[PDB]
Amino acid sequence: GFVVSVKVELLFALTDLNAEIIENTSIPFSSEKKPEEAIELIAKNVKKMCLLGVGIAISGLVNRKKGTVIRSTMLGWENVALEAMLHAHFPDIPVYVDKNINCYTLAELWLGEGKQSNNFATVSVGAGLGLSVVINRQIYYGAQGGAGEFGHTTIQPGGYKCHCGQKGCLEMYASEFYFRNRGEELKEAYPTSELNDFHFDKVAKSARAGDEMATELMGKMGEYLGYGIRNIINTFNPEKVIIVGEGLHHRDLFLTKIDEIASQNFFSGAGFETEITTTSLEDPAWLQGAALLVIHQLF
Amino acid sequence: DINRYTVLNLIREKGEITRTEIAKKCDFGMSTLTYILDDLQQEGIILEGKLVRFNKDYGFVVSVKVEEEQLLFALTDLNAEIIENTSIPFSSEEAIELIAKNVKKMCGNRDMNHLLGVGIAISGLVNRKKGTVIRSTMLGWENVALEAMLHAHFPDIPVYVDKNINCYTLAELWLGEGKQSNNFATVSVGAGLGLSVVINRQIYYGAQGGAGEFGHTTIQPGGYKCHCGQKGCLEMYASEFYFRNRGEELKEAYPLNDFHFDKVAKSARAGDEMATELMGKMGEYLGYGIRNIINTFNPEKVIIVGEGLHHRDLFLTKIDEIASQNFFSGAGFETEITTTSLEDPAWLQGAALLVIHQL
Ligand SMILES: [Zn+2]
Ligand SMILES: [Zn+2]
Numbered sequence: 001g002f003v004v005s006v007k008v009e010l011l012f013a014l015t016d017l018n019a020e021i022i023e024n025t026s027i028p029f030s031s032e033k034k035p036e037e038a039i040e041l042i043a044k045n046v047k048k049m050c051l052l053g054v055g056i057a058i059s060g061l062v063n064r065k066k067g068t069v070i071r072s073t074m075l076g077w078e079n080v081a082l083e084a085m086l087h088a089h090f091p092d093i094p095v096y097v098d099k100n101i102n103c104y105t106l107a108e109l110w111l112g113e114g115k116q117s118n119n120f121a122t123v124s125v126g127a128g129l130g131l132s133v134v135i136n137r138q139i140y141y142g143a144q145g146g147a148g149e150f151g152h153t154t155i156q157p158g159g160y161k162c163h164c165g166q167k168g169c170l171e172m173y174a175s176e177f178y179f180r181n182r183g184e185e186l187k188e189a190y191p192t193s194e195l196n197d198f199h200f201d202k203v204a205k206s207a208r209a210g211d212e213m214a215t216e217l218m219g220k221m222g223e224y225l226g227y228g229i230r231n232i233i234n235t236f237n238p239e240k241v242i243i244v245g246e247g248l249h250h251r252d253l254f255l256t257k258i259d260e261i262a263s264q265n266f267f268s269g270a271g272f273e274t275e276i277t278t279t280s281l282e283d284p285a286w287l288q289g290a291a292l293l294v295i296h297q298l299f
Numbered sequence: 300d301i302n303r304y305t306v307l308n309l310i311r312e313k314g315e316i317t318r319t320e321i322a323k324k325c326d327f328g329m330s331t332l333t334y335i336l337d338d339l340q341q342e343g344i345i346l347e348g349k350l351v352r353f354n355k356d357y358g359f360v361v362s363v364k365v366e367e368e369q370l371l372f373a374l375t376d377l378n379a380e381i382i383e384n385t386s387i388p389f390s391s392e393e394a395i396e397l398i399a400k401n402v403k404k405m406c407g408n409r410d411m412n413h414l415l416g417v418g419i420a421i422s423g424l425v426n427r428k429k430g431t432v433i434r435s436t437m438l439g440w441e442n443v444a445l446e447a448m449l450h451a452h453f454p455d456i457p458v459y460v461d462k463n464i465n466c467y468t469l470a471e472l473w474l475g476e477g478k479q480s481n482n483f484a485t486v487s488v489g490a491g492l493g494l495s496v497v498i499n500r501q502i503y504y505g506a507q508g509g510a511g512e513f514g515h516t517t518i519q520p521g522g523y524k525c526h527c528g529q530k531g532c533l534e535m536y537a538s539e540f541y542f543r544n545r546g547e548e549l550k551e552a553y554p555l556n557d558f559h560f561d562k563v564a565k566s567a568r569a570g571d572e573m574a575t576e577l578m579g580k581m582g583e584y585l586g587y588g589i590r591n592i593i594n595t596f597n598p599e600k601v602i603i604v605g606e607g608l609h610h611r612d613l614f615l616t617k618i619d620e621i622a623s624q625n626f627f628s629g630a631g632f633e634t635e636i637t638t639t640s641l642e643d644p645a646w647l648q649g650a651a652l653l654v655i656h657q658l
Binding site for chain 2 (some may be wrong): 071142145155
């Protein structure tokens with residue numbers, strides 16, 4: 001009995017019951033306010049790799065009980081009954097959906113750095129901020145399944161507009177979003193600047209090259225990530241905080257900064273430290289997660 | 300083993316209940332149930348009228364609140380009702396001598412086999428598991444072994460120490476708004492900012508018993524110097540400390556002398572512009588703090604409480620204007636935000652519930 005994990009960006013993957021990626025694909029497609037069509041390309045590619053279930057990791061708010069995507073501000077999705085829209089293509093196959101950061105966390109819980117820690121917090125640095133908090137090997141969902149919305153905490157009251165409708169969100173300061181938000185006000189202050197594409201890799205690239213504007217952007221993004229992690233430390237008081245995500249590719253330009261600040265937390269004054277590490281798994285562990293999503297519920 | 304517990308809880312939860320009323324919601328037989336009720340009866344832990352009830356007076360409890368200029372003390376029944384309360388002054392290791400001395404005064408001539416325990420509410424960073432106060436800026440304390448030290452005088456009986464906001468959270472659980480809900484959050488404000496989140500009717504202590512220090516989350520990078528060392532802590536904008544930090548800079552933009560909370564509040568109510576601006580901004584920042592708590596823990600309801608102040612004096616409409624603009628509200632999920640229904644004594648009942656809920 002095998003499983004197929006899905007991830008919406010689209011990423012597919014065939015795995016056995018140990019979450020091992022046997023065969024993945026990477027279909028190029030944009031799902032900006034396009035859910036009815038996106039599901040048809042999925043169900044298509046899903047049957048192509050061929051199955052006890054399908055797991056779907058995605059960016060947004062989600063109600064796992066009904067399997068509904070309550071809200072994806074990235075993709076602009078409002079109340080899409082994804083768990084039901086797939087029974088049109090696979091009636092009796094159990095389908096489950098979850099927050100991508102909680103899918104990755106399942107991966108850490110069973111392959112990565114969960115084999116020791118029974119209670120920690122995972123934070124995703126990348127194109128936006130994610131958080132997932134484990135308690136006795138259990139992901140915390142809160143009352144309505146929505147806990148962990150840490151990227152929309154206000155780090156700068158009166159700050160940058162955020163896709164959520166609010167201002168000053170952490171995600172606008174402590175991720176790739178920052179670069180866009182702040183790179184414009186830094187165009188005229190840095191006229192002869194190399195940089196012009198404000199994505200992580202481009203900014204990362206210009207910054208190792210010594211380009212001031214990129215050096216500023218990546219410096220500040222770190223500070224704010226340090227704040228965000230320190231807010232997590234002062235709030236949850238976890239044994240450890242694991243940083244993950246495609247941002248780690250450019251770790252050299254932030255992890256140590258993140259540490260300067262986060263280490264300077266409330267509880268450190270009493271000798272007891274809080275390990276801040278990085279993920280042992282690889283980028284394909286988001287898919288092993290979504291796969292695990294179905295596997296755990298089954299057993 | 301476990302059965303007594305399940306029967307006994309079911310008996311408090313209702314206060315009064317009958318044998319067959321119990322049996323229904325009990326995964327075992329009447330023959331087993333008779334054993335347990337007959338034994339708990341002779342223990343004196345329950346009482347019969349047909350109807351069986353909990354013995355609030357099988358035992359009694361004392362709680363203690365350790366403060367700046369005083370030491371509170373209380374003697375509750377086993378429902379956490381307060382039969383006797385006193386207070387004694389205290390400025391600043393002899394604090395235990397004082398407590399123990401005062402403990403035995405409360406009881407009067409009461410039987411000492413019936414004193415079931417002692418709960419201590421204190422401010423700062425506590426490790427309830429170890430019975431030690433790790434840090435109390437306010438008092439000038441560091442790794443004090445409150446439990447062990449005090450155990451000297453009451454070795455046969457349990458001492459439990461916890462952070463104020465938790466002691467008051469259990470109060471909410473067993474007496475207030477915490478009885479309806481099972482996953483709420485409690486915020487304190489006054490002295491500084493305190494937070495206790497409850498998960499499955501249980502306080503989240505985290506890895507080393509320190510979660511909830513929400514007052515030192517950064518809400519303004521590089522802003523007002525917190526007493527913690529960090530800069531721009533929430534607690535410097537969303538609490539009585541805001542007025543010390545912003546008070547003097549505003550005098551220049553408004554020509555009020557004292558910046559204690561009850562002073563600013565009262566002055567505002569009298570229509571002073573400066574006080575009003577101060578009272579207004581404190582409510583915004585408090586509003587951000589609660590919005591961050593919502594996006595983070597996602598509780599059923601939030602409970603605001605004054606510590607050394609009356610929550611009605613707060614600008615509740617600005618707190619809620621800001622707080623209700625969270626991430627779950629976009630998808631129309633409104634989180635209930637209210638003040639507490641309890642009063643001052645619930646801090647001391649809280650510390651009594653600390654001992655009571657552990658039996
Ligand atoms: Zn936002
Ligand atoms: Zn602080």
